[PDB]
Amino acid sequence: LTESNKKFLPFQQFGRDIADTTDAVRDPQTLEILDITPCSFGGVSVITPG
Amino acid sequence: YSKHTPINDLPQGFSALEPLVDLPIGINITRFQTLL
Numbered sequence: 001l002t003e004s005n006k007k008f009l010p011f012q013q014f015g016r017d018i019a020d021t022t023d024a025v026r027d028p029q030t031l032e033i034l035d036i037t038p039c040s041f042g043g044v045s046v047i048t049p050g
Numbered sequence: 051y052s053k054h055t056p057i058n059d060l061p062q063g064f065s066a067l068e069p070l071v072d073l074p075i076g077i078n079i080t081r082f083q084t085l086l
């Protein structure tokens with residue numbers, strides 16, 4: 001949840017890109033927009049000379 | 051939902067209506083009337 005440069009409409013809470021996946025949220029208590037970047041992941045390859 | 055727009059007569063312009071009120075639960079409303 002990092003700060004984002006987006007600017008919601010005053011009534012808007014959700015933030016969504018074209019994936020049906022949430023990518024921004026308006027924080028309820030303090031009115032700010034936070035990003036929803038997923039936690040890092042990826043395959044693990046092993047380089048071996050045999 | 052509400053919106054207020056100025057004109058010079060439904061104009062040809064485009065303006066989306068911003069939601070403003072989400073009044074809580076009621077029961078079946080099948081009829082209405084305006085308070086003139």
Ligand SMILES: *[C@@H]1O[C@H](CO)[C@@H](O)[C@H](O)[C@H]1NC(C)=O
Binds near residue numbers: 029030031
């Ligand atoms: C609730 O009040 C205002 C309204 O958003 C906000 O600034 C404040 O941080 C919130 N929390 C408290 C404890 O006042």
Ligand SMILES: *[C@@H]1O[C@H](CO)[C@@H](O)[C@H](O)[C@H]1NC(C)=O
Binds near residue numbers: 077078
């Ligand atoms: C209107 O809503 C009421 C809820 O109590 C229910 O009887 C029905 O869905 C509707 N009534 C009708 C169709 O007479």
